[PDB]
Amino acid sequence: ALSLTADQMVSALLDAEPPILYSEEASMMGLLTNLADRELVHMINWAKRVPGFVDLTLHDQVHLLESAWLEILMIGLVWRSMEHPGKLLFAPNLLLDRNQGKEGMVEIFDMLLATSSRFRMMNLQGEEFVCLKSIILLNSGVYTFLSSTLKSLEEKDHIHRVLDKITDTLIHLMAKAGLTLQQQHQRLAQLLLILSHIRHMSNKGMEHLYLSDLLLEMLDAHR
Amino acid sequence: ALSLTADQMVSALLDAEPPILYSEYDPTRPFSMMGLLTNLADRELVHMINWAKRVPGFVDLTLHDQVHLLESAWLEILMIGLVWRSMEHPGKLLFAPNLLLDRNQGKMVEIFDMLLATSSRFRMMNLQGEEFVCLKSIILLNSGVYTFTLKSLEEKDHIHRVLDKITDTLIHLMAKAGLTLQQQHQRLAQLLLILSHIRHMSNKGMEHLYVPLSDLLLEMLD
Ligand SMILES: CN(C)CCOc1ccc([C@H]2C[C@]3(C)[C@@H](O)CC[C@H]3[C@@H]3CCc4cc(O)ccc4[C@H]32)cc1
Ligand SMILES: CN(C)CCOc1ccc([C@H]2C[C@]3(C)[C@@H](O)CC[C@H]3[C@@H]3CCc4cc(O)ccc4[C@H]32)cc1
């Protein structure tokens, strides 16, 4: 993991991407839940392909996915919706506007649409997107490992080492886009600050919903 | 604001720092914790508004947008302030000089641990004062910028231009400390990723926490 070049990192993440799934007023939440549950299965397979992730203990892999899974679903939704102003592309056959969200759902819908609009304005590129999604996976739960055994300290150090490599990769991508050193750290900062708003929307979504055994079952594979 | 140098931005942010307040209880009397902490936070919020008015670029926004940004960020800002002054007190939170609490007195339990871990992370990274004041201003300008008309796009543009100015300043400070370019952007990323965790704690705090606040903020701004 830590020996990969930036191009090799991008290649690995692009190759890990999960498929775009298809769906299937009163049935709308059931449709969305069924989709999200099917997407979570593929998210587990994707996470095992993010360099460094399977180097962690099963317990830590579970902790990271338990913290980040809804952020990951949301950032994937915002990415799929980016070219569709005013709409959230939950699936190619499930494209919704605000009025269809009208439960406390519309507040989240507006936040998601705003993030999609921001991605569009920044002209977010697909290689940047996969780097952001991997950052979410590794970062969101790394401050809530409630133990510091020696093993936990080693795990946290490895995660931070891999996060550093993804940053280096994001900078590399912008440098190849002909950006200025100053433009490079400015864009890096702008992208990472959007991650704070994605956390916010995940918290709100989790409230609106009101898992670790399922995660470990899917993660705890045999050979 | 956009014309300040990085040294000038740092100096302005340092000069704008609010004072450390004391908890308002009799030390010559039996030792109410939630009441004490709320009273402290309410007094700190006034000084927070004064600090915000001194963050370069903030008062150039409309009063409505100033209010929106403070309403979104205020608990995050109180939290990063708390973590920063607890940094030299492992396993404790220095809410005030006369109100230093550990885990057990915290029993808030879940957030208390989150705050302690943030403090540990800052301690481990050897966060400097000049970096802290940049991160705190970034929270002010970024937290509400996604939840706001041509004036609005102008306002958002101005906010991002200032944020870009503060990113330049963080980079300048790290370059000054002798970091390589690789180490600068790695450190920049590590600090900004901690801000996602402060957002999470603020959301939990709001959750646990529960005249509009916008009206009170408006009166304090005047
Ligand atoms: C995974 N299951 C174990 C738990 C169920 O998880 C989910 C069930 C439904 C959704 C839906 C319905 C939610 C929460 C609304 O109420 C407010 C925000 C909505 C989510 C936004 C992000 C998102 C992304 C997807 O790609 C598929 C569905 C969803 C949505 C998202 C996750
Ligand atoms: C500002 N008022 C309009 C509303 C009341 O605000 C507050 C009232 C109390 C606090 C307290 C008590 C809280 C919420 C706990 O329950 C969970 C997290 C706690 C806060 C953590 C951060 C913090 C920072 C301070 O420097 C002073 C108090 C507080 C705490 C923070 C803000």
Curated annotation (Swiss-Prot), chain B:
Tissue expression pattern: Widely expressed. Not expressed in the pituitary gland.
Known outcome of mutating L216A: Abolishes interaction with NCOA1, NCOA2 and NCOA3
Residues holding 17beta-estradiol: E44, R85, H208
Chain segments carrying region Self-association: 1-222
Stretches for region Transactivation AF-2: 5-222
Free-text description of this protein's post-translational modifications in UniProt: Phosphorylated by cyclin A/CDK2 and CK1. Phosphorylation probably enhances transcriptional activity. Self-association induces phosphorylation. Phosphorylated by LMTK3 in vitro.
Annotated domain remarks: Composed of three domains: a modulating N-terminal domain, a DNA-binding domain and a C-terminal ligand-binding domain. The modulating domain, also known as A/B or AF-1 domain has a ligand-independent transactivation function. The C-terminus contains a ligand-dependent transactivation domain, also known as E/F or AF-2 domain which overlaps with the ligand binding domain. AF-1 and AF-2 activate transcription independently and synergistically and act in a promoter- and cell-specific manner. AF-1 seems to provide the major transactivation function in differentiated cells.
Binding partners and assembly: Binds DNA as a homodimer. Can form a heterodimer with ESR2. Interacts with FOXC2, MAP1S, SLC30A9, UBE1C and NCOA3 coactivator. Interacts with PELP1, the interaction is enhanced by 17-beta-estradiol, the interaction increases ESR1 transcriptional activity. Interacts with EP300; the interaction is estrogen-dependent and enhanced by CITED1. Interacts with CITED1; the interaction is estrogen-dependent. Interacts with NCOA5 and NCOA6 coactivators. Interacts with NCOA7; the interaction is a ligand-inducible. Interacts with PHB2, and UBE1C. Interacts with AKAP13. Interacts with CUEDC2.
Family: Belongs to the nuclear hormone receptor family. NR3 subfamily.
Leftover remarks: Selective estrogen receptor modulators (SERMs), such as tamoxifen, raloxifene, toremifene, lasofoxifene, clomifene, femarelle and ormeloxifene, have tissue selective agonistic and antagonistic effects on the estrogen receptor (ER). They interfere with the ER association with coactivators or corepressors, mainly involving the AF-2 domain.
Disease: Estrogen resistance: A disorder characterized by partial or complete resistance to estrogens, in the presence of elevated estrogen serum levels. Clinical features include absence of the pubertal growth spurt, delayed bone maturation, unfused epiphyses, reduced bone mineral density, osteoporosis, continued growth into adulthood and very tall adult stature. Glucose intolerance, hyperinsulinemia and lipid abnormalities may also be present.
Protein name per UniProt: Estrogen receptor
Species: Homo sapiens
